[PDB]
UniProtKB/Swiss-Prot annotation:
Residues covered by the BRCT domain: 1-85, 99-202
First and last residues shown, out of full length: 569 to 777 of 777
Localization per record: Nucleus
Gene expressing this chain: BARD1
Subunit and partners: Homo- and heterodimer. Heterodimer (RING-type zinc finger) with BRCA1. Heterodimer (via ANK repeats and BRCT domains) with CSTF1/CSTF-50. Component of the BRCA1-A complex, at least composed of the BRCA1, BARD1, UIMC1/RAP80, ABRAXAS1, BRCC3/BRCC36, BABAM2 and BABAM1/NBA1. Interacts with UBXN1.
Protein name: BRCA1-associated RING domain protein 1
Signal peptide per UniProt: none
Length: 202
């Protein structure tokens, strides 16, 4: 059935969401897992929280808090389309509805060094949820261990090198050598929020 989760909600907001889960006869979780169907955000904006990002990568409804208010008001499951955060969340939801590849399908990620603002464990979860693969060893751009890989990234722009150069060294805040890019974790996060494989050339 329906499984609801809040992201960045205040005390009263979390209660209202609890009250709503009772009314719709749905689960309300505190921690995200793949069974989640709806993420409610406190305003009308997508947040760079783990919960929102995992919601986006899983193609969940990401909804304005007014949805909750409107639902309690009507005692009905309000058509979520009308309360959906536009851009990233909507694009990902439509992507899932069309049964298309996940955001990072065909992509590989090596997490370089330490991470103080976007914890490493969070990045790993996002890569996995987005259908990407974690590399345990730094990708050797000049080695045949790297250039012979056959994958393509579905979500790369039509004439991007990212369609076929799909390996990434992610570091905490030359851009490409062979099939491997170096990109800051801020780029990676921006990709999730936008549901786009954003250019590193542009």
């Amino acid at each position: 059935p329906l499984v609801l989760i809040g992201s960045g909600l205040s005390s009263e907001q979390q209660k209202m969401l609890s009250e709503l889960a009772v009314i719709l006869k749905a689960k309300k979780y505190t921690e995200f897992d793949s069974t989640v169907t709806h993420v409610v955000v406190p305003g009308d904006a997508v947040q760079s929280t783990l919960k929102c990002m995992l919601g986006i990568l899983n193609g969940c409804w990401i909804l304005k808090f007014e949805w909750v208010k409107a639902c309690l008001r009507r005692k009905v499951c309000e058509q979520e389309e009308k309360y959906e955060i536009p851009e990233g969340p909507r694009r990902s939801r439509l992507n899932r509805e069309q049964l298309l590849p996940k955001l990072f399908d065909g992509c590989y990620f090596y997490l370089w060094g330490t991470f103080k603002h976007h914890p490493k464990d969070n990045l790993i979860k996002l890569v996995t949820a987005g259908g990407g693969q974690i590399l345990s060893r730094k990708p050797k751009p000049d080695s045949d261990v790297t250039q012979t890989i056959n994958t393509v990234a579905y979500h790369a722009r039509p004439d991007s090198d990212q369609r076929f150069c799909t390996q990434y060294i992610i570091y905490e805040d030359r851009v490409r050598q062979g099939k491997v890019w170096k990109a800051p974790s801020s780029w990676f996060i921006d990709c999730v929020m936008s549901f786009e494989l954003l250019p590193l050339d542009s």
